């Protein structure tokens, strides 16, 4: 859709859409920027992620409302509308997964970009798994697991334990274990080990890096408190 707009203009419009909380626009602008075929900078990867996370986050919240009504009710309208929302959500996830596969991931060679995209891939398969109920639910779950696992393996080899993307990846993989894979003990173990190894590395950091890392460590702690 965005083929006639300059890459830099798409990026500037994505930033403006973020300021205006127009996340559907911002996702469309960032999709156009990706389709320009150049690799994304650190800032641009964040813009891409923020846009689609907000879009699918609203879809997930609407799906949960409608699923809650549908389970309480158990005419066809509630099922039909939950299905419509569900199809829209799957379409957004498929779009993001298609961008990662064509061709963000294969061109991402530095640890920071490759772990970022693979965490994205695990997340959007996780959102697919949240609504999956048919023949391929197991394959969807394994696709999320495999993406997260590769990202974990890279982040442990290449990143310090306080690196924000390493922390937030481990956070989301722990949520995957707890909510999707029915493995709460793995979820708890991962959140504990992630927190403790980051805590032991905090002394190496500047004031601003310390703030970035401890913020995500708080989220790990919140989950541990909820789960134990």
């Amino acid at each position: 859709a965005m083929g006639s707009m300059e890459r830099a203009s798409l990026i500037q419009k994505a930033k403006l859409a973020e300021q205006a909380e127009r996340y559907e626009d911002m996702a469309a602008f960032m999709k156009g920027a990706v389709e320009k075929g150049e690799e994304l900078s650190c800032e641009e990867r964040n813009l891409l992620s923020v846009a689609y996370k907000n879009v699918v986050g609203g879809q997930r919240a609407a799906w949960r409302v409608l699923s809650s009504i549908e389970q309480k009710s158990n005419g066809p309208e509630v099922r039909e509308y939950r299905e419509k929302v569900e199809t829209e959500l799957q379409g957004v996830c498929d779009t993001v997964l298609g961008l990662l596969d064509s061709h963000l991931i294969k061109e991402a060679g530095d640890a920071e970009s490759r772990v970022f995209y693979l965490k994205m891939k695990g997340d959007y398969y996780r959102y697919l798994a949240e609504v999956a109920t048919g023949d391929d639910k197991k394959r969807i779950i394994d696709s999320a697991r495999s993406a997260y696992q590769e990202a974990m393996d890279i982040s442990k080899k290449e990143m310090p334990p306080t690196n924000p993307i390493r922390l937030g990846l481990a956070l989301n993989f722990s949520v995957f274990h707890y909510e999707i894979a029915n493995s709460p003990e793995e979820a708890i173990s991962l959140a504990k080990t992630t927190f403790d190894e980051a805590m032991a590395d905090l002394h190496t950091l500047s004031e601003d890096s310390y703030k970035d890392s401890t913020l995500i460590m708080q989220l790990l702690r919140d989950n541990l408190t909820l789960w134990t």
Binding site: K53, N172, V175, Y178, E179, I216, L219, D222, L226
Partner: peptide, 7 residues
């Protein structure tokens, strides 16, 4: 629900 990563 548990917290996944968010800004």
């Amino acid at each position: 629900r548990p917290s996944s990563w968010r800004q």
